[PDB]
Design a protein around this nucleic acid. Structure first.
Ligand code: SF4
Ligand SMILES: [Ca+2]
Ligand SMILES: [Ca+2]
Length: 222
DNA sequence: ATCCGGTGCT
DNA sequence: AGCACAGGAT
């Protein structure tokens, strides 16, 4: 697989099209982490006002940790999934007491926190710290299942481990953050659930599902 | 190594 | 009412 050329074409694309969303203003692990929790449940158009107001109320991780839960829940009002923000609250309290207020940059450590799974680990540590971990969410599973014609149930751990391995193989290690972002952005903008925009896709030349005319049938879920 | 749940949509 | 989504789940 021509990894170097693929990276070129994907990142050249991403440099052109990258959206300057609010959570892309800096590489604060705390802000990145908050945006990822919000975006796991809710579309980005809705997330935009909530994120800006949440951070305004809680500018730092210690600010969040120090807040009463009632305050946290009120800030979350409208997003739903209240138990997810309670878990976020718990996790940042642990970060403050145990990790001196700094989001741990070791994957195994960060993963030990309540609510923090493989995607959240990879997304935060690669976007904020440049740690070359995969950040495989639904978008990325869709993109990769198409590029490499993966027909296995994406609900399975074995399928997700295969996606991770693919990423570790093809990742641009000179910038794992931009690489992971670009895969996610591709799935947001171009390689969409229905009717992906293959005629405008920067990595069309590499895509097995397009070559086989079966993009719309991917990913497989059961 | 999952399979669960809160949510939106219909 | 049933269904799809989307990640973490221990
Ligand atoms: S060519 Fe079509 S299916 Fe293949 S990656 Fe690009 S958008 Fe997705
Ligand atoms: Ca974990
Ligand atoms: Ca099974």
């Amino acid at each position: 697989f021509p990894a170097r050329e693929f990276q070129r074409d994907l990142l050249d694309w991403f440099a052109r099209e990258r959206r300057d969303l609010p959570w892309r203003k800096d590489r604060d692990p705390y802000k990145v982490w908050v945006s990822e929790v919000m975006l796991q449940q809710t579309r980005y158009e809705t997330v935009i006002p909530y994120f800006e107001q949440f951070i305004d109320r809680f500018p730092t991780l210690e600010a969040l940790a120090d807040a009463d839960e009632d305050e946290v829940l009120k800030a979350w009002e409208g997003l739903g999934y209240y138990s997810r923000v309670r878990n976020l609250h718990a996790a940042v309290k642990e970060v403050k007491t145990r990790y001196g207020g700094k989001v741990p940059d070791d994957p195994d450590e960060f993963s030990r926190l309540k609510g923090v799974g493989p995607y959240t680990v990879g997304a935060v540590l690669s976007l904020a710290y440049g740690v070359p971990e995969p950040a495989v969410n639904g978008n990325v599973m869709r993109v990769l299942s198409r590029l490499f014609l993966v027909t296995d149930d994406i609900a399975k751990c074995s399928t997700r481990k295969r996606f991770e391995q693919i990423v570790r193989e093809i990742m641009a290690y000179e910038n794992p953050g931009a690489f992971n972002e670009a895969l996610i952005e591709l799935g947001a903008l171009v390689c969409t659930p229905r009717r992906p925009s293959c005629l405008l896709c920067p990595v069309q030349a590499y895509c097995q599902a397009f070559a086989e005319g079966v993009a719309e049938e991917l990913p497989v879920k059961m």
